[PDB]
Amino acid sequence: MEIVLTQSPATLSLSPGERATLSCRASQSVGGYLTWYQHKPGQAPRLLIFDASIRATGIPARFSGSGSGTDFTLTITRLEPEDFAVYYCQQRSMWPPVTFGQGTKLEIKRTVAAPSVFIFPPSDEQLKSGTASVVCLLNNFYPREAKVQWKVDNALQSGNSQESVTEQDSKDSTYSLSSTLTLSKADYEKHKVYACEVTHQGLSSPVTKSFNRGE
Amino acid sequence: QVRLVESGGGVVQPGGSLRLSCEGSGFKFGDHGIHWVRQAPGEGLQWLTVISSDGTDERYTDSVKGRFTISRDNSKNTMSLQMNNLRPEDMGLYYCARDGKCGGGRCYSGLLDYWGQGTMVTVSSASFKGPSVFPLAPSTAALGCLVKDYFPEPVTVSWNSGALTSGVHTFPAVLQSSGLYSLSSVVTVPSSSLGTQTYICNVNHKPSNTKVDKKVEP
Amino acid sequence: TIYNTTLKY
Numbered sequence: 001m002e003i004v005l006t007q008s009p010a011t012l013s014l015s016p017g018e019r020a021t022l023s024c025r026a027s028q029s030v031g032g033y034l035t036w037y038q039h040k041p042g043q044a045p046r047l048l049i050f051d052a053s054i055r056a057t058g059i060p061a062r063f064s065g066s067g068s069g070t071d072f073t074l075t076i077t078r079l080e081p082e083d084f085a086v087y088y089c090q091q092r093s094m095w096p097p098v099t100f101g102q103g104t105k106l107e108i109k110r111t112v113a114a115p116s117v118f119i120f121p122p123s124d125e126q127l128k129s130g131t132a133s134v135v136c137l138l139n140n141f142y143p144r145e146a147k148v149q150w151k152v153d154n155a156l157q158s159g160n161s162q163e164s165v166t167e168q169d170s171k172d173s174t175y176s177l178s179s180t181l182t183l184s185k186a187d188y189e190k191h192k193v194y195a196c197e198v199t200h201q202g203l204s205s206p207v208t209k210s211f212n213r214g215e
Numbered sequence: 216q217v218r219l220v221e222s223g224g225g226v227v228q229p230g231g232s233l234r235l236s237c238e239g240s241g242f243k244f245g246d247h248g249i250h251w252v253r254q255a256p257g258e259g260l261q262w263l264t265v266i267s268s269d270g271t272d273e274r275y276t277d278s279v280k281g282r283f284t285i286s287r288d289n290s291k292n293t294m295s296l297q298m299n300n301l302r303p304e305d306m307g308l309y310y311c312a313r314d315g316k317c318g319g320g321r322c323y324s325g326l327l328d329y330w331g332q333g334t335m336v337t338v339s340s341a342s343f344k345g346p347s348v349f350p351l352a353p354s355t356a357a358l359g360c361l362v363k364d365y366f367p368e369p370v371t372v373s374w375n376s377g378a379l380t381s382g383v384h385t386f387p388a389v390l391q392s393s394g395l396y397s398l399s400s401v402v403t404v405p406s407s408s409l410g411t412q413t414y415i416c417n418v419n420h421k422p423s424n425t426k427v428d429k430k431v432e433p
Numbered sequence: 434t435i436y437n438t439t440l441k442y
Contacts, residue, residue, distance in 0.1 A: 033439060035326060044330045045260070045310065050436070056328075057434070088260055092325025092439045096274045098250070098262035120351040120359070133361055135351050137401055139384070162389040164399070178386040178399040180361075211354075272442035315436040324436035 003027050003091050007101035013109040013143075016081055022074040022104050024089030029069045033093040036065060036074050039086045039103075041167060048087075049074065084108055084168070107144075110173040114202030115141035119195075119209040122188065132188035136196030136209070138177040140169075143201060150181045151195035151210075157181060188213070217241035217329055221311050223295075224334030226343075226367050226422075233298040235334060237311030245269065245289035248314035248323050251296055254333075255307040265314060266294060267323060278304070301338050308333040341366045341394030345425025348418050351401060353409055353433045359401030360416035360429050364393070372400040373417045409433055 004027040014020055024034065036049040047056045049065035052072060062083070064075040076083050089101040115138040122132035136148055144165065150157035161181040168175060179196070195210035223235040237249060250265040264275045266285045273285050282301075287294035298305065310333045315326035344366045351359035362370055372385050382403035388396040400416055409432070418427040 033325070033437075037327075039260075042332075044332045045312075045327075046330070047326075047328050050315075050326055090327070095325055095440060096262070096265075097276045098252075098265075098325055098327075100260045100262070103259045116357075118354075118357045120354070123349045123352065123361075126347070126349045126361075129347070133349065133363065133397075135359070135361060135399060137351075137357060137359075137399075139357070139403070162391070162397070164387040164389050166384055166386060176384045176386070178384075178401070180389070180397065180399070267442065274440075316434070317438040318435045319438065321442045322438040323440040323442075325439040326436045328436075 002097055003030060003094055003099050005089055005091060005099055005101040007089060007104045009104060010102070011105045011107060013107045014079060015109045016079050018079050020076040020079055020083070020106060022087055022106075024067075024072040024074070024101050026070040026072075026091060028094075030091045030093035032068060033091060034065075034067065034072050035090045035092065037088045037090060038083075039088060041085075045088070081108075108168055108173040110142045112202045113140060113142045113174055115139055115146065115177075115198065115200055115207075117196065117198050117207050117209050119211055121194065121211055121213070127185050127188070130185045132183045132185055134181045134183070134194055134196075136179045136181070136198075138179075138198060140172060140174040140176055141200060141202060142174050144175050145201070146175075146177055147199040148177070148179045149197040149199070150179075151193070151197060151208075152181075152183075153191050153193050219311050219313060219329055219331035221309060221331045221334035224309060224336045226337040226339060227301055228340055229302060229338055231301050231338075233301060233336060235296040235298065235309060235336075237294050237296075237331060239292045239313070244287075244292045247316055248272075249287065249294050250312040250314060250327055251285070252310045252312055252327070252330075253305075253307045254310070255304075258307070264296070265323065267321070268314070269321075272321070272323075298336070301336075303338050306336060306338040308335050337367055339367070339394055343367065343423045344395060345420050345423040346370060346418060346427065348416065348427040348429040350429060350431040351399070352431060353404070355403055356406050356409065357401055357403050358414060358431050359399060360418070360431060361397070361399055362416075362418055363397040364391070364395040365397075365420050365423065365425075366395050367422055368396060369421075370396070370398065371419045371421070372398075374400070374402055375413070375415055376417060379414070
């Protein structure tokens with residue numbers, strides 16, 4: 001009908017020098033018409049392996065493709081930093097539509113590093129506009145999974161904040177996170193204690209950074 | 216030297232329209248069919264359409280037939296894509312991709328041997344707006360600029376006109392309920408120097424022709 | 434270099 005491709009795992013976290021093993025499952029035989037692409041952020045996707053097992057031009061030997069029918073494997077033996085990207089499988093056996101896998105992300109495994117946490121209050125300059133933004137910053141941590149809980153006069157906030165995470169650091173392999181809680185000026189001036197509570201593997205217990213409005 | 220370049224992306228409103236182009240070079244354009252593949256923000260890749268080498272055959276995915284029409288002009292190393300009735304579903308980054316040379320007859324290989332970088336299609340109901348830049352005041356210390364309420368992407372941030380690069384983290388923007396973007400750029404510096412050393416974030420929102428320079432202090 | 438055909442018209 002259209003071949004659904006399934007990739008596993010969704011995220012793969014390894015260390016440079018290790019062997020990576022990636023899989024792509026078709027819903028129905030694609031025979032040997034299976035291609036693998038490498039994709040880096042904001043770079044053009046690149047052909048690696050075609051027909052399940054053929055190395056394209058320029059592609060180094062550490063990249064290996066194997067499989068037949070419905071189960072396929074992409075192997076990379078001595079992982080280097082530039083092999084950390086997103087890998088997609090693709091099928092050309094039964095088309096249209098050409099179909100792709102959802103992608104497997106290969107990420108750098110690093111030792112656990114706990115975040116530095118900072119809280120920033122809204123600027124007066126922002127207050128005159130009738131809105132208040134409070135920022136909580138999480139610097140240089142690993143792993144990526146982090147949790148930020150906003151607390152205003154001990155009331156847990158939900159749905160009034162947004163989060164963004166950085167791409168894995170090219171030198172450090174760590175992540176950083178910015179979280180913004182926004183409130184009306186009126187609500188902000190009506191409350192007193194503002195808190196950012198952080199949970200992470202590298203911390204024995206949750207870190208809370210807070211300020212009291214006025215001060 | 217084999218290159219493919221996309222153009223024509225921009226911002227439109229839902230129901231709006233667009234014409235995209237892909238430009239090949241380094242090869243006999245007419246020897247290969249060309250594909251379009253799209254990537255929606257935070258999503259994987261999806262195939263959209265292809266046109267044949269000769270320009271006689273075209274295929275489209277279910278989702279866009281009736282809306283998009285692909286064509287080419289081999290005389291000019293060029294193909295285009297007319298996008299009508301743009302939805303939110305269509306938002307994303309669009310790559311033109313070469314169909315690998317099927318030896319042949321009237322063929323398509325289905326193999327995408329060369330891809331371009333992509334051109335961006337944004338679908339929104341929001342109006343262009345320059346950002347409001349707020350200080351994230353130091354209180355080693357961290358400080359920053361909150362770049363808020365702009366449309367659209369992107370915004371470029373630098374510190375001290377580019378002389379300050381170390382310990383700088385400029386975060387991906389978040390799309391607010393309003394339809395506007397908001398982002399954070401921070402830097403870690405020494406407590407000693409807060410007294411003297413000026414730290415200014417320089418913001419350039421090119422789509423709105425808006426430039427802000429913000430000095431951040433305790 | 435030239436790939437196998439998978440679709441025709």
